[PDB]
Amino acid sequence: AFINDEQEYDQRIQYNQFQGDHFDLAAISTRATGLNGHLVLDCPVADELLSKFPDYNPAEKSGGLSREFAFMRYTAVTCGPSNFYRDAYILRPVHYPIPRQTELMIVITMYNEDDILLGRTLKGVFKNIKYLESKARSSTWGKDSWKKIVVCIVSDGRTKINERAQALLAGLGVYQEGLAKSRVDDKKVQAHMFEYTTRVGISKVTDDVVKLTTEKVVPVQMLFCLKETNAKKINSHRWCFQAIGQVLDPKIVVLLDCGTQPSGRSLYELWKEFDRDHRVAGACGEITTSLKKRQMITNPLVYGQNFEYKISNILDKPTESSFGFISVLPGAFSAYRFIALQNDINGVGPLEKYFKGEFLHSSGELDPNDDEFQMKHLMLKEEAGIFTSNMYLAEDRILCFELVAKRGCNWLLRYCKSARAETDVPEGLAEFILQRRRWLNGSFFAAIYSLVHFYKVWTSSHSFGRKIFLHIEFFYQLINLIVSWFSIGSYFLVFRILTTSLGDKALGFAPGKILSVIFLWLYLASIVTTFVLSFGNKPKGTEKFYVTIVIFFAILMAYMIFAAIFMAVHSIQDIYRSGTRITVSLFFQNSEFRDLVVATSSTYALYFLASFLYFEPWHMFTSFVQYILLSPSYVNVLNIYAFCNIDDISWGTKGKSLGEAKLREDGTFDVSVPISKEQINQSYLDQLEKIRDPAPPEEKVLVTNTEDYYAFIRSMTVLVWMFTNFVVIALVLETGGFNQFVEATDLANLKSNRAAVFLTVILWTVAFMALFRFIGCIYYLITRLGREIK
Amino acid sequence: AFINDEQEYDQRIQYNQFQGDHFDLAAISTRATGLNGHLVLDCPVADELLSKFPDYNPAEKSGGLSREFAFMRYTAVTCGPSNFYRDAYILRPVHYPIPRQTELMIVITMYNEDDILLGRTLKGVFKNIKYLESKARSSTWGKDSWKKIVVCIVSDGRTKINERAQALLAGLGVYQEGLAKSRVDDKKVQAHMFEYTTRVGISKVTDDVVKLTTEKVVPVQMLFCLKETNAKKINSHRWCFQAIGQVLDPKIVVLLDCGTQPSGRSLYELWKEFDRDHRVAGACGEITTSLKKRQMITNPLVYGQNFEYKISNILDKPTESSFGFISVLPGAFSAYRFIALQNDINGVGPLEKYFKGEFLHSSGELDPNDDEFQMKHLMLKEEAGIFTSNMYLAEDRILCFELVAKRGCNWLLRYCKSARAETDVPEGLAEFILQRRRWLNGSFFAAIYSLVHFYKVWTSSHSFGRKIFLHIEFFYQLINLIVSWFSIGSYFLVFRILTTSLGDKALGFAPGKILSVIFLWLYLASIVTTFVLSFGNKPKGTEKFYVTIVIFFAILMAYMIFAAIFMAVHSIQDIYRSGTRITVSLFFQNSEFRDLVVATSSTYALYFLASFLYFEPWHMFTSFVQYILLSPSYVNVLNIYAFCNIDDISWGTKGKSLGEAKLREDGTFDVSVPISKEQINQSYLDQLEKIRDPAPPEEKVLVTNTEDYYAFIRSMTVLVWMFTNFVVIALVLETGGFNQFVEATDLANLKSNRAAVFLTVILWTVAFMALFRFIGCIYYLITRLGREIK
Numbered sequence A, B: 001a002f003i004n005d006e007q008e009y010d011q012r013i014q015y016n017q018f019q020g021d022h023f024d025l026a027a028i029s030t031r032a033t034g035l036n037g038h039l040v041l042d043c044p045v046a047d048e049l050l051s052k053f054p055d056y057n058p059a060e061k062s063g064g065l066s067r068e069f070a071f072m073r074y075t076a077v078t079c080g081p082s083n084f085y086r087d088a089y090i091l092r093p094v095h096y097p098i099p100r101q102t103e104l105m106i107v108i109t110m111y112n113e114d115d116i117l118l119g120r121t122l123k124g125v126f127k128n129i130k131y132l133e134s135k136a137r138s139s140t141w142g143k144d145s146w147k148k149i150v151v152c153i154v155s156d157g158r159t160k161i162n163e164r165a166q167a168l169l170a171g172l173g174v175y176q177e178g179l180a181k182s183r184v185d186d187k188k189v190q191a192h193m194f195e196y197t198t199r200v201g202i203s204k205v206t207d208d209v210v211k212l213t214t215e216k217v218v219p220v221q222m223l224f225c226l227k228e229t230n231a232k233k234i235n236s237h238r239w240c241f242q243a244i245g246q247v248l249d250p251k252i253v254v255l256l257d258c259g260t261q262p263s264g265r266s267l268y269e270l271w272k273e274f275d276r277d278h279r280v281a282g283a284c285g286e287i288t289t290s291l292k293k294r295q296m297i298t299n300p301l302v303y304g305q306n307f308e309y310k311i312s313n314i315l316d317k318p319t320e321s322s323f324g325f326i327s328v329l330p331g332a333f334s335a336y337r338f339i340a341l342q343n344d345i346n347g348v349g350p351l352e353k354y355f356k357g358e359f360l361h362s363s364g365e366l367d368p369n370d371d372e373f374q375m376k377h378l379m380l381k382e383e384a385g386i387f388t389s390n391m392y393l394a395e396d397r398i399l400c401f402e403l404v405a406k407r408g409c410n411w412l413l414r415y416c417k418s419a420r421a422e423t424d425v426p427e428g429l430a431e432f433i434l435q436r437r438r439w440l441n442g443s444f445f446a447a448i449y450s451l452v453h454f455y456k457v458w459t460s461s462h463s464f465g466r467k468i469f470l471h472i473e474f475f476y477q478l479i480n481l482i483v484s485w486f487s488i489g490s491y492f493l494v495f496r497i498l499t500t501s502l503g504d505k506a507l508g509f510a511p512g513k514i515l516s517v518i519f520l521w522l523y524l525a526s527i528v529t530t531f532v533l534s535f536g537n538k539p540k541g542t543e544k545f546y547v548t549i550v551i552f553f554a555i556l557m558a559y560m561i562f563a564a565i566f567m568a569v570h571s572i573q574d575i576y577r578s579g580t581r582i583t584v585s586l587f588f589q590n591s592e593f594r595d596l597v598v599a600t601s602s603t604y605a606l607y608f609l610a611s612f613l614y615f616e617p618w619h620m621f622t623s624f625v626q627y628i629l630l631s632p633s634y635v636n637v638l639n640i641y642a643f644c645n646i647d648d649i650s651w652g653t654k655g656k657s658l659g660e661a662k663l664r665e666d667g668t669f670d671v672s673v674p675i676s677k678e679q680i681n682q683s684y685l686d687q688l689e690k691i692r693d694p695a696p697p698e699e700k701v702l703v704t705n706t707e708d709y710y711a712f713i714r715s716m717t718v719l720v721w722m723f724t725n726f727v728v729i730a731l732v733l734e735t736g737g738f739n740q741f742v743e744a745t746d747l748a749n750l751k752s753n754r755a756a757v758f759l760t761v762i763l764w765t766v767a768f769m770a771l772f773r774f775i776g777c778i779y780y781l782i783t784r785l786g787r788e789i790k
C-alpha cells in the first residue's frame, strides 16, 4: 500500500516543523465521557500509521506526536442540520484553546463512488494545499497555512457508500469501523462525524489501484460526515452550509464532486479572484474532459462532450462573467462567499430559496419523532405557489440569481479561466441521457424564473449602467430561451425544407423524392418511439433503441448537409450559366446561397477565431465532427426525455395481531376466546347497532399526495410544448387544415416563400447570437488582460 | 334490526321441520382442542339469535336446537390453496357421520363492498334457495334441498373488508371477532374460515339500511373465508376451486360478485341447463343494469351502458351459444361444471392455464418461509413464452377456450336467457374507464390467443360438422378482431372524409371549411392529450379532462351525422334535378346515397327487429341516442387508456444496527469501542489489504425485475398499433409523403376515389357483421323454442 511543478512546492516547504496544537481528549476506559453531553470519543489511531510519520520515535509511547495527530475524534449527531448550531456540538478546529479561523472550506460530495475517483479528488486537493503552504511572499498564505483549510467529505447514505472508498478513508486514518453507533439515548443518529489531521498523501492514482505514502506530505484537516440515510444532494449541501458552516464560519466555501481533479494552483486562483474584488460572491473554473485512453472514432460521444464543454467555457462563461451574471455555476467545481449566502433577518434569502425545494419536493409523510418536525410542518403548511413548489428543478442555479438581485446588496458572479478541473464524462448513452435530464430541466426553469422576476434587480444597489447591461443580458437570455423552446420544431422544419427542395425537377437529382419520403417516415417513427419510451421505460433497459435513433439522426444530419451544399452549388451555377455581369452584390442577393452558406460559414469562422484567441484550437478539429453529427440527437432525444420526466418521483406509494395460539405439551391448543354468555350477547348487539344505521357521507376533502401534482405539472408542460411547436410547424409548411384555404397552384409558391423566410430567420438568428457571444468573449479577454497588468 | 312469486314458495314449504344433523364439537374450556392438529373452535352463538328461531324453547339450555344451528365453527388455515386438501383440513359438511354431497356451490367474491351490495346478493341467493326448497315434483330438489347447497364468501384482505359488510355477516351469525388468531405454532394464518348454518334471512334491502328477520327463513350453509392479505381475484378463485372445491367435490360451481342480485329462479335455470345436456361445461345468464332512480338525461352513461348490455345479450351471446363457443363468460354471473375444469394426469389443464397468470404476473420476490415456496419457485424457474407470461390479461376468458378445445373431451358453452341477474354499473367516468381497461385488454388477448391456437380443436372429440362450424366462428372472430384493431383509424378517416365533403363548393354550405379545420385541430388535440394523460396521470385525478373530451366527441358525432344526412339529401336532389327516368336502380347505383343511407338503415333495422323478437324493445328508444353519441368515446378514450396501461404494475420497487449507547446515572456514556492496540492494528491492516487490490469485473448477469418486461411489452404493443393505424390512414387520405408522387390536379380525384372506396368497405363490413349476428340470434331462438317443446 505504501511506496515537475509539484517538485517546486516541496523545495519551499521545510517539512521538519509540523507539530500540532494540544487539545483536551475524551476519557475512554467501556464507559466513555462525551463533551457537552454528546457522544464524543477520542480514539487512538493504528500504531503503524503513527510509525510511518518521520517525527515518530520508537521510545515514545505515542512517538512524540501531537494530540491531534495521535487521536481521531468521533461524534454522533442526532439533531440534524437545522439544530446543529443550536445544540452544543463543537468541532475540533474551534475547540482548541486558541481558536482557529477557517479561510477555505473545501467541501467534497460523494455517493457510492469508486475509490479511484475519491483518490483523484483528494490528490488534487492535497496538491493545492501543498502549493498554498509553499507560497512564501503571501500575506495570508505560507507557513502554517494548512490550519486555515478544512476538507469536508459528506457521504450520502451509510449503506450506499462504496466499500473501497471507505477503505481509502480508513487508510487515511479518518474512519474506524467500531466507533459508529446507531442510537444514543433512544435517539437516532442522523450523522456520524470523523475528524482527523491526516499526514498521509496519495502518491499516485493508477487506473486500478491507489498508492498512498507518508513522504513529503503536508498535514490536512479532514472532516468526514457519513449520513445515516440518503436524502439526495440538497440535504448534503444543507449539512455543509446550514450546520457545519455556521460553526466553522468560513470564507469562500469551495464545492467539489468525486471524480473532479483540480489543477495544482486552481484553488489559489479561485481564492485570488475572491480576494481582488470584494463585490464577487461566486466563482467558477474551467472544466475539462479527460481524453487519455479514449479514441477519436471509438468514442464519438466523449469527443462531442469535449467540444461542447470547450465551446461553453470559451463563449458562454466569459460573456456572462463580463455582464456580471452567470446563469449556472457548475456544482462539480465552484466557490461561494459565505457571508453573501446568509439570509436576512426577516428569514428570506438565497439559502432559504435553495433549501425550500428539498422540503417541498418530497412525500408529505413527516415522522412525528423527528426533531425537525416543527420546521418541516410549518414549511409544508405554508401556501406555496408554482415557482416555490417547483424550485427543486433549478437547484444551485437559483442561488446565482438570488445573489445578483438582492434587495440592497451589490454582488457579482465571475468566471476565471486560470482555474481548471478535469472530470470524467459519462461514456454510456443511458447515463448521458440521465445526466442531461436534470441539466435541461434546471436550465429551463432557472431561465423562466429569472426572466419573470427580472424587476427584482431594480432595488439592488448597483450602478445604473450595471442595471442597464443586466437588462441587456436578460433580453439576450429571453431570445435564447425562445430559440431553445422551438428547437425540435425548427429542426423538423429545416429538415423537411431541405429534403423537399431536392425533389424539385429543376435540379438533377433522381432519388431525392423517395429519399425524402423515407426519411420523413423514419423521423416520425423515431420521434413517436422516443416519446413512448420516455414515458414508459427506463433508459438503461432500452438503450439499443436510443442508440439506433441517434445513429439515424446522425445519418440524417449528414444527408441534410449534403442537400444544403448541393442546393448552394446549383444556385451558384444558375447565377453563372445565364450571365448577368456577375458581382458580389448578386451573390449576396441570392436567398439560397446567402442563407445556406454565408450564415453557417460566418458562425463557424466566429467559433474558429474564438477558439484560436484562447490558445485552445485542437477541439475545433478533433471533436467538431462528432458534435455536429450529434446535434440533432441533443435537440430531440435529450429534450424529449427531459420534458417527459420533469417530475422526479423518487418516493414510492403510501408507506395489531389478533392473537397467538401456541401448541402446549398436550394436543390442546392454548387460545383466548370469549366464553361468557354476557360478552357474546354484548358483541352481537354491538354488531347489530353498527349495521342498524345509515351510511354518513365521507366528505374526506383530503389534501392527497404531491406526486399527482408534479405529474399534472409535467403533463401540462409537455402538452403546451407540443401545441406551440405544432402551431409553428403548421404556419410554416401549411401542414394542418391551412392548405384548404388555398388552391392547387398557389399552395406550392406560398409554401416555398414561407420556407425561405423561415430558413433565413433561423440561420441569421443563430449567426447573430454567435456574434454576440464572440464580442462578449473578446471583451472578457481584454478586460482580464488589463486587470492582470494592473 | 329485526322486523308475489316469493309468497308462492312459502306456501309449499312446511317450515316446521328443520332439525339439523348432529356433529362432534371441539372442547373449549382457555385451552381448546383442535381437530386433526389444526386450530378449530366450535363456539356458541349469541343467545338472542337462538331465541329468534321459532323452535327455540326457553326451558332448554340451547333451546333444543341442533348442534349445527347452536354452534359456529372457526378454522385457521396456514398452508394455503395448494396444500389445503393434502393437509387434514376438514369442512363441516363432509364431517357429518353421514357424508353430505354438494350439488351447487354458490361462490361470492367480495372486496371492500358496502353492506348494501352484499345484502342484495344474499337476498337473491336466499330467494333462489327458497324456490329450490319449495319445488315439489323434482327428483333432485325439494325437501332437505338446502343440505346440497353451500354458499362460499371469499373476502379479499382482512384489513380491506368494509366494516358494515362484516357487521352484516356477524348479524347472520357466521362471524365473531374474538375467535380470529394471527399465528398458530409460529406459522402465519393465511385464511380464516367461519362455518355456520344460518336461519337469518334478509327481509328487505333499502337504499341506506338492511333489515334481516327470522320469519319464514330456510336454513343456509355459509362458509366465510377471510383472507389475511389481499392477492387479487385470481387467488380468491384459487381458494374456491383448488382448495375448497376438492374437499367439497361439488358440481356446477356458480360464480357471483357483490352487487349482483340474481332473480327468483335464475339458479334453477342454470342448473337445468347443465342437467339437460351433459356436454355443457359452462353457462352464463343475462345481466341487466338497474335504472330505478336514474334519469334518462341526467345519466347518459348509465343508459348507454344499458343499451350496450342489452345488445350484447340479444345478438352476441345467442350466436356464440349457437356455435357452441362463447368468447367470454361474465365473471359477475356464470357457472362451470367442476369435473370439466379438472386438469389432466400430465398436469396440463384449464385450471393450470388460468392459475399460471397469478404466479407469472408478480414480483419475483418469494419468501422462503412460505409453504408454497417450492411450487412458485418451480413455476417461475420454468421457461415461459409470450403467451404463457401474458396469460394474466385473459383471466377467466382463457378457461372457455381451454374447455372447448380439449385434447379428447367434448364440451360446449351455452347461454340461457331464462337466468337473469341485475348489477350496478359505474356511474362515474373514471370508474367506467378503469373497468373497461381490463375488459378490453382481456378481450383482445383472448381473441389473439384463440386465433393463433385454432388448431387445438382438431384433436378434440367433436363431430366433423361441429368442427366446421367452430372454424366458421373462428373466421368471424378474426374479422371482428381486424375491424376492432383499426377502429381509431377508421373513425378518424370517416370523420375527415365527411367533414371535408361539406367543404366542396358544389353543395351550398358556407361554414363547412372553417368548421372542418377547427374540428380537425380539436380532434388532434384531444387524441394527444388522451395519450399523455393515459401514460402520465390517473383517471380519478384528471377526470374533467376526460369529461371534456367525451363531450367534444359527442358533439363531433352529431355534426358527422348531420353532414352525412346533408350529403345524402344533396345526392338525391342531384338525382332528381337533371331528370334521368328515375328508378330504384339509379338510387342503388349512387355511391353516396347507397353507402351513407342504405347500410346504416339496414343495420338499425336489424337491431330493431332483433330487439322486438326478444320482447325487449324499450332500450331501442330510451337508451339508443346516448350509446350513439358515446360510440366515438368508446373507441378513442377507452381503447387508448387500455393499450397505454396493458401492464398492471401493482407491486412497488424492490422491498444490523451498529450499536446502542445509553446514558448511565453518571454523565458518562456506555459504549463498546476497540481498545487493544492489536485489534486496531489488525483492522487497519485489513482496510489496507481491502484497498490494495484491483477491482474485479461485476459480471452480475442478473435476471432483473419483471416490471421492465411488462412495460416493454406494452410499449411495443402501442407502437405497433400506432404504426399500423397510421399506415392505413396515409394510404386512404394520402396524408404522408404519398402526395409527392402525384400532381396538383390528380391528387384531389385520387383522394376522393380512395375515400369513397374506404367508406363503402367499412359500412358494408359493419352491416354484414350485423346480419351475421342477426341470423345467429334467430337460430338461437328457434332452437331454444324447439328444445322447450321437447
Ligand SMILES: NC(=O)OC[C@H](O)[C@@H](O)[C@H](N)C(=O)N[C@H](C(=O)O)[C@H]1O[C@@H](n2cc(C(=O)O)c(=O)[nH]c2=O)[C@H](O)[C@@H]1O
Residues within 6 Å of the ligand: A109, A110, A111, A112, A113, A156, A230, A231, A232, A233, A236, A257, A258, A259, A287, A330, A331, A332, A423, A424, A425, A426, A435
Ligand atoms: N459540470 C458537471 O456537473 O459535471 C460533473 C459530472 O459530470 C457529474 O456527473 C458529477 N460526477 C456529479 O456531480 N454527480 C452527482 C450529481 O451531479 O448529482 C454528484 O452528486 C452526488 N450525489 C448523487 C446522488 C444520486 O446520483 O442520486 C445522490 O443521491 N446523493 C449525492 O450526494 C454524487 O456523489 C456526485 O458527487
Ligand SMILES: NC(=O)OC[C@H](O)[C@@H](O)[C@H](N)C(=O)N[C@H](C(=O)O)[C@H]1O[C@@H](n2cc(C(=O)O)c(=O)[nH]c2=O)[C@H](O)[C@@H]1O
Residues within 6 Å of the ligand: B109, B110, B111, B112, B113, B156, B230, B231, B232, B233, B236, B257, B258, B259, B287, B330, B331, B332, B423, B424, B425, B426, B435
Ligand atoms: N359483467 C360484469 O362483470 O360486470 C360486473 C360489475 O360491473 C363489476 O364491477 C363487479 N362489481 C365486479 O366483479 N368487481 C370486481 C371485479 O370485477 O374484479 C370484483 O372482484 C372483486 N375483487 C376486486 C379487487 C380490486 O378491485 O382490485 C381485488 O383486489 N380483489 C377482489 O376479489 C370485487 O370484490 C368484486 O367482486
